[PDB]
Amino acid sequence: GNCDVVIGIVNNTVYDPLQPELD
Amino acid sequence: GNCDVVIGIVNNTVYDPLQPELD
Numbered sequence: 001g002n003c004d005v006v007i008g009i010v011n012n013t014v015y016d017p018l019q020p021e022l023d
Numbered sequence: 024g025n026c027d028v029v030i031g032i033v034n035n036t037v038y039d040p041l042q043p044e045l046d
């Protein structure tokens with residue numbers, strides 16, 4: 001979805017395992 | 024987890040298709 005639709009959602013950072021390996 | 028606590032354990036390599044896929 002979009003961030004606006006849900007209620008009580010908190011800004012945070014999600015980490016991806018794949019990106020470090022690629023670099 | 025880490026490979027210390029579990030009572031019965033065996034050694035084999037989890038293939039992780041990812042390394043092959045990136046290259």
Ligand SMILES: *[C@@H]1O[C@H](CO)[C@@H](O)[C@H](O)[C@H]1NC(C)=O
Pocket residue numbers: 007008009
């Ligand atoms: C949580 O409850 C407070 C009142 O205690 C209210 O002001 C706030 O908007 C509520 N937040 C959510 C995300 O439901």
